[PDB]
Design an enzyme around this catalytic site. Structure first.
Site, PDB file in Angstrom:
ATOM      1  N   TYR A  53       0.849  -1.181   0.000  1.00 23.44           N
ATOM      2  CA  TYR A  53       0.000   0.000   0.000  1.00 23.44           C
ATOM      3  C   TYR A  53       0.886   1.234   0.000  1.00 23.44           C
ATOM      4  O   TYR A  53       2.023   1.191   0.477  1.00 23.44           O
ATOM      5  CB  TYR A  53      -0.947   0.020   1.208  1.00 23.44           C
ATOM      6  CG  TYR A  53      -0.262  -0.209   2.537  1.00 23.44           C
ATOM      7  CD1 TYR A  53       0.356   0.837   3.216  1.00 23.44           C
ATOM      8  CD2 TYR A  53      -0.232  -1.470   3.112  1.00 23.44           C
ATOM      9  CE1 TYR A  53       0.987   0.627   4.432  1.00 23.44           C
ATOM     10  CE2 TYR A  53       0.392  -1.690   4.327  1.00 23.44           C
ATOM     11  CZ  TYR A  53       0.999  -0.640   4.983  1.00 23.44           C
ATOM     12  OH  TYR A  53       1.619  -0.871   6.192  1.00 23.44           O
ATOM     13  N   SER A  85       5.032  -2.380  14.054  1.00 25.97           N
ATOM     14  CA  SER A  85       4.691  -3.144  12.861  1.00 25.97           C
ATOM     15  C   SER A  85       3.912  -2.330  11.835  1.00 25.97           C
ATOM     16  O   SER A  85       3.641  -2.847  10.746  1.00 25.97           O
ATOM     17  CB  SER A  85       3.878  -4.381  13.245  1.00 25.97           C
ATOM     18  OG  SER A  85       2.599  -4.009  13.730  1.00 25.97           O
ATOM     19  N   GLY A  86       3.535  -1.100  12.155  1.00 23.40           N
ATOM     20  CA  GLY A  86       2.873  -0.219  11.222  1.00 23.40           C
ATOM     21  C   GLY A  86       1.379   0.006  11.433  1.00 23.40           C
ATOM     22  O   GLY A  86       0.693   0.403  10.477  1.00 23.40           O
ATOM     23  N   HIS A  89      -5.724   6.672  12.271  1.00 21.75           N
ATOM     24  CA  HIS A  89      -5.528   7.782  11.351  1.00 21.75           C
ATOM     25  C   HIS A  89      -6.817   8.113  10.615  1.00 21.75           C
ATOM     26  O   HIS A  89      -7.775   7.334  10.597  1.00 21.75           O
ATOM     27  CB  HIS A  89      -4.400   7.481  10.356  1.00 21.75           C
ATOM     28  CG  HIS A  89      -4.730   6.413   9.361  1.00 21.75           C
ATOM     29  ND1 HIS A  89      -5.583   6.624   8.299  1.00 21.75           N
ATOM     30  CD2 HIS A  89      -4.311   5.130   9.256  1.00 21.75           C
ATOM     31  CE1 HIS A  89      -5.678   5.517   7.585  1.00 21.75           C
ATOM     32  NE2 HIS A  89      -4.916   4.594   8.145  1.00 21.75           N
ATOM     33  N   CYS A 114      -4.573  -0.941  10.057  1.00 16.71           N
ATOM     34  CA  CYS A 114      -4.721   0.339  10.727  1.00 16.71           C
ATOM     35  C   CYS A 114      -6.156   0.537  11.197  1.00 16.71           C
ATOM     36  O   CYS A 114      -7.101  -0.048  10.661  1.00 16.71           O
ATOM     37  CB  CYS A 114      -4.359   1.484   9.783  1.00 16.71           C
ATOM     38  SG  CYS A 114      -2.605   1.831   9.680  1.00 16.71           S
TER      39      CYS A 114
END
EC number: 2.3.2.-
Length: 259
Positions: free
Chosen positions: A169, A182-183, A187, A205
Protein backbone atom coordinates in the site's frame (compact mmCIF):
# COMPACT_ATOMS: atom_id res chain seq x y z
CA UNK A 1 35.02 -0.12 21.94
CA UNK A 2 32.55 2.26 23.54
CA UNK A 3 28.76 2.14 23.61
CA UNK A 4 26.54 5.07 24.53
CA UNK A 5 23.03 4.69 26.03
CA UNK A 6 19.78 6.61 25.35
CA UNK A 7 16.87 6.95 27.75
CA UNK A 8 13.21 7.41 26.80
CA UNK A 9 10.84 9.08 27.51
CA UNK A 10 12.53 12.48 27.40
CA UNK A 11 13.33 14.59 30.44
CA UNK A 12 10.34 16.57 31.70
CA UNK A 13 7.81 14.73 29.53
CA UNK A 14 4.31 13.77 30.65
CA UNK A 15 3.32 10.35 29.32
CA UNK A 16 0.37 7.97 29.55
CA UNK A 17 -0.12 5.15 32.03
CA UNK A 18 1.24 2.60 29.54
CA UNK A 19 4.64 4.20 28.98
CA UNK A 20 7.61 1.92 29.73
CA UNK A 21 11.09 3.16 30.49
CA UNK A 22 13.33 2.39 27.50
CA UNK A 23 17.14 2.24 27.42
CA UNK A 24 18.76 1.74 24.00
CA UNK A 25 22.42 1.07 23.23
CA UNK A 26 24.14 1.83 19.93
CA UNK A 27 25.96 -1.53 20.17
CA UNK A 28 24.88 -5.06 20.99
CA UNK A 29 24.99 -5.67 24.74
CA UNK A 30 26.94 -8.84 25.51
CA UNK A 31 26.29 -8.60 29.28
CA UNK A 32 22.63 -7.68 29.73
CA UNK A 33 22.86 -8.08 33.50
CA UNK A 34 25.67 -5.54 33.62
CA UNK A 35 23.45 -3.03 31.83
CA UNK A 36 20.51 -3.77 34.13
CA UNK A 37 22.58 -3.29 37.29
CA UNK A 38 23.74 0.10 35.96
CA UNK A 39 20.21 1.56 35.61
CA UNK A 40 18.53 2.92 38.75
CA UNK A 41 14.82 3.74 38.53
CA UNK A 42 12.98 5.54 41.33
CA UNK A 43 9.20 5.99 41.46
CA UNK A 44 6.92 8.10 43.65
CA UNK A 45 4.65 6.64 44.81
CA UNK A 46 7.00 3.64 44.86
CA UNK A 47 5.98 0.70 42.66
CA UNK A 48 7.76 -2.52 41.72
CA UNK A 49 9.03 -2.96 38.17
CA UNK A 50 11.42 -5.12 36.18
CA UNK A 51 13.63 -5.13 33.10
CA UNK A 52 12.87 -7.05 29.90
CA UNK A 53 14.85 -6.92 26.66
CA UNK A 54 13.06 -6.35 23.35
CA UNK A 55 16.30 -6.94 21.44
CA UNK A 56 20.07 -7.06 21.90
CA UNK A 57 20.15 -3.25 21.97
CA UNK A 58 17.04 -2.13 23.89
CA UNK A 59 15.81 -2.92 27.41
CA UNK A 60 12.41 -1.97 28.84
CA UNK A 61 11.27 -1.41 32.43
CA UNK A 62 7.66 -1.25 33.60
CA UNK A 63 5.43 -2.18 36.55
CA UNK A 64 3.03 -5.12 36.71
CA UNK A 65 0.02 -2.87 35.98
CA UNK A 66 -0.46 0.45 34.20
CA UNK A 67 1.15 3.39 36.00
CA UNK A 68 -0.82 5.23 38.65
CA UNK A 69 -1.69 8.69 37.27
CA UNK A 70 0.48 11.36 38.88
CA UNK A 71 3.46 9.07 39.49
CA UNK A 72 6.87 10.72 39.18
CA UNK A 73 9.69 8.62 37.70
CA UNK A 74 13.45 9.23 37.74
CA UNK A 75 15.82 7.13 35.62
CA UNK A 76 19.61 7.23 36.11
CA UNK A 77 21.54 5.24 33.47
CA UNK A 78 24.90 5.17 35.27
CA UNK A 79 26.81 3.23 32.60
CA UNK A 80 30.07 5.22 32.55
CA UNK A 81 33.06 2.89 32.65
CA UNK A 82 30.81 -0.17 32.98
CA UNK A 83 32.10 -3.22 31.13
CA UNK A 84 29.08 -4.45 29.17
CA UNK A 85 30.83 -7.67 28.13
CA UNK A 86 33.67 -8.52 25.74
CA UNK A 87 35.54 -5.28 26.43
CA UNK A 88 32.61 -2.97 25.63
CA UNK A 89 32.49 -0.04 28.07
CA UNK A 90 29.79 2.55 28.64
CA UNK A 91 30.91 5.99 27.50
CA UNK A 92 28.83 8.12 29.89
CA UNK A 93 25.74 8.36 32.10
CA UNK A 94 22.32 9.70 31.09
CA UNK A 95 19.24 10.68 33.06
CA UNK A 96 15.56 11.46 32.66
CA UNK A 97 12.70 12.58 34.90
CA UNK A 98 9.07 12.36 33.82
CA UNK A 99 5.53 12.15 35.17
CA UNK A 100 2.48 10.02 34.43
CA UNK A 101 -0.57 11.87 33.13
CA UNK A 102 -4.24 10.99 33.20
CA UNK A 103 -5.39 7.43 32.55
CA UNK A 104 -6.30 7.37 28.84
CA UNK A 105 -7.55 4.00 27.56
CA UNK A 106 -9.11 3.66 24.10
CA UNK A 107 -10.80 0.33 23.36
CA UNK A 108 -11.33 -0.74 19.73
CA UNK A 109 -14.07 -3.38 19.90
CA UNK A 110 -14.53 -5.30 16.64
CA UNK A 111 -17.84 -6.70 17.90
CA UNK A 112 -19.21 -3.14 17.98
CA UNK A 113 -16.80 -1.63 15.41
CA UNK A 114 -16.37 1.22 17.88
CA UNK A 115 -13.27 2.86 19.38
CA UNK A 116 -14.23 4.26 22.79
CA UNK A 117 -11.83 6.68 24.50
CA UNK A 118 -12.15 6.72 28.30
CA UNK A 119 -10.28 9.22 30.48
CA UNK A 120 -10.06 8.19 34.14
CA UNK A 121 -12.88 5.72 33.51
CA UNK A 122 -15.19 8.24 31.83
CA UNK A 123 -16.20 7.74 28.22
CA UNK A 124 -15.14 10.93 26.47
CA UNK A 125 -15.24 9.81 22.83
CA UNK A 126 -16.91 7.11 20.74
CA UNK A 127 -15.65 6.83 17.16
CA UNK A 128 -16.89 4.37 14.52
CA UNK A 129 -13.86 2.62 13.08
CA UNK A 130 -12.85 0.23 10.31
CA UNK A 131 -9.95 -2.09 11.12
CA UNK A 132 -7.99 -4.73 9.21
CA UNK A 133 -9.93 -6.87 6.77
CA UNK A 134 -10.24 -10.59 7.50
CA UNK A 135 -7.17 -11.47 5.41
CA UNK A 136 -5.07 -8.74 7.10
CA UNK A 137 -6.70 -8.34 10.51
CA UNK A 138 -5.73 -6.05 13.36
CA UNK A 139 -4.16 -8.07 16.16
CA UNK A 140 -5.91 -8.10 19.52
CA UNK A 141 -4.08 -6.93 22.62
CA UNK A 142 -2.64 -3.88 24.36
CA UNK A 143 -0.88 -1.22 22.25
CA UNK A 144 1.19 1.66 23.63
CA UNK A 145 0.71 4.96 21.78
CA UNK A 146 3.88 6.17 20.07
CA UNK A 147 4.71 8.99 17.69
CA UNK A 148 2.10 11.12 15.93
CA UNK A 149 2.10 12.69 12.46
CA UNK A 150 -0.01 15.49 11.00
CA UNK A 151 0.49 14.06 7.50
CA UNK A 152 2.49 11.06 6.30
CA UNK A 153 2.66 8.73 3.30
CA UNK A 154 1.83 5.29 4.69
CA UNK A 155 4.01 3.12 2.44
CA UNK A 156 4.27 -0.65 2.81
CA UNK A 157 7.87 -0.51 1.52
CA UNK A 158 8.85 1.15 4.81
CA UNK A 159 8.21 -2.32 6.29
CA UNK A 160 9.77 -4.40 3.50
CA UNK A 161 6.49 -5.06 1.65
CA UNK A 162 6.54 -3.85 -1.98
CA UNK A 163 3.71 -1.45 -2.67
CA UNK A 164 2.51 -3.54 -5.63
CA UNK A 165 2.66 -6.79 -3.64
CA UNK A 166 -0.58 -8.42 -2.43
CA UNK A 167 -0.50 -6.60 0.93
CA UNK A 168 1.34 -3.52 -0.27
CA UNK A 169 0.00 0.00 0.00
CA UNK A 170 1.04 3.62 -0.52
CA UNK A 171 -1.40 6.34 0.53
CA UNK A 172 -1.20 9.82 2.05
CA UNK A 173 -2.97 10.04 5.42
CA UNK A 174 -3.59 12.81 7.95
CA UNK A 175 -3.67 12.77 11.76
CA UNK A 176 -1.84 9.47 12.23
CA UNK A 177 -1.11 8.20 15.75
CA UNK A 178 1.19 5.19 15.79
CA UNK A 179 0.39 2.28 18.11
CA UNK A 180 2.67 -0.48 16.76
CA UNK A 181 6.18 -0.65 15.34
CA UNK A 182 4.69 -3.14 12.86
CA UNK A 183 2.87 -0.22 11.22
CA UNK A 184 -0.54 0.01 12.94
CA UNK A 185 -1.86 3.58 13.20
CA UNK A 186 -5.04 5.33 14.19
CA UNK A 187 -5.53 7.78 11.35
CA UNK A 188 -7.96 9.75 9.23
CA UNK A 189 -9.65 7.71 6.49
CA UNK A 190 -12.18 9.78 4.55
CA UNK A 191 -12.45 7.00 1.95
CA UNK A 192 -13.89 4.48 4.44
CA UNK A 193 -16.29 6.65 6.46
CA UNK A 194 -19.17 4.60 5.05
CA UNK A 195 -17.60 1.37 6.32
CA UNK A 196 -16.49 2.72 9.72
CA UNK A 197 -18.66 1.04 12.34
CA UNK A 198 -19.77 -1.65 9.88
CA UNK A 199 -17.02 -3.34 7.86
CA UNK A 200 -13.26 -3.75 8.26
CA UNK A 201 -11.35 -2.62 5.18
CA UNK A 202 -7.75 -1.77 6.12
CA UNK A 203 -4.39 -3.57 6.15
CA UNK A 204 -4.35 -3.35 9.95
CA UNK A 205 -4.72 0.34 10.73
CA UNK A 206 -7.63 1.76 12.72
CA UNK A 207 -9.56 3.93 10.27
CA UNK A 208 -11.63 6.75 11.79
CA UNK A 209 -13.24 9.93 10.49
CA UNK A 210 -11.06 12.99 9.77
CA UNK A 211 -12.45 14.92 12.74
CA UNK A 212 -12.15 11.89 15.03
CA UNK A 213 -8.57 11.27 13.85
CA UNK A 214 -7.66 14.90 14.48
CA UNK A 215 -9.20 14.63 17.95
CA UNK A 216 -7.17 11.48 18.65
CA UNK A 217 -3.98 13.18 17.46
CA UNK A 218 -4.69 16.19 19.68
CA UNK A 219 -5.80 14.42 22.87
CA UNK A 220 -3.96 11.07 23.06
CA UNK A 221 -0.27 11.20 23.97
CA UNK A 222 2.59 8.73 23.93
CA UNK A 223 2.17 6.18 26.69
CA UNK A 224 -1.63 6.21 26.50
CA UNK A 225 -3.22 2.81 25.87
CA UNK A 226 -5.21 1.36 22.98
CA UNK A 227 -6.71 -2.08 23.56
CA UNK A 228 -8.02 -4.00 20.54
CA UNK A 229 -10.52 -6.76 21.37
CA UNK A 230 -12.66 -9.30 19.53
CA UNK A 231 -10.92 -9.22 16.14
CA UNK A 232 -10.26 -12.33 14.04
CA UNK A 233 -6.51 -11.78 14.37
CA UNK A 234 -4.05 -13.10 16.91
CA UNK A 235 -2.32 -11.17 19.66
CA UNK A 236 0.17 -8.37 19.14
CA UNK A 237 3.71 -9.71 19.73
CA UNK A 238 5.14 -8.63 23.06
CA UNK A 239 8.42 -7.53 21.46
CA UNK A 240 6.79 -5.43 18.70
CA UNK A 241 8.22 -2.26 20.26
CA UNK A 242 4.86 -1.01 21.54
CA UNK A 243 3.35 -4.32 22.71
CA UNK A 244 5.19 -4.70 26.03
CA UNK A 245 2.01 -5.23 28.05
CA UNK A 246 1.16 -8.40 26.09
CA UNK A 247 3.95 -10.25 27.91
CA UNK A 248 2.48 -11.72 31.13
CA UNK A 249 3.95 -10.28 34.31
CA UNK A 250 5.47 -13.60 35.38
CA UNK A 251 7.52 -13.83 32.17
CA UNK A 252 8.39 -10.11 32.13
CA UNK A 253 9.52 -10.08 35.77
CA UNK A 254 11.53 -13.25 35.24
CA UNK A 255 13.39 -11.21 32.62
CA UNK A 256 15.69 -12.39 29.86
CA UNK A 257 19.15 -11.09 30.77
CA UNK A 258 20.56 -14.61 30.34
CA UNK A 259 19.00 -15.03 26.88
Amino acid sequence: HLTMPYVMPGDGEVVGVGEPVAIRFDENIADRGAAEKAIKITTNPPVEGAFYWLNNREVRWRPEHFWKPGTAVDVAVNTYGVDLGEGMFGEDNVQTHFTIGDEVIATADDNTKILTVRVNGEVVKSMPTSMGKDSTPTANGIYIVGSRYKHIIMDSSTYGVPVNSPNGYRTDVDWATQISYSGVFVHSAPWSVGAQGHTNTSHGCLNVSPSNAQWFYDHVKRGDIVEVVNTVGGTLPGIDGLGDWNIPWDQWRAGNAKA
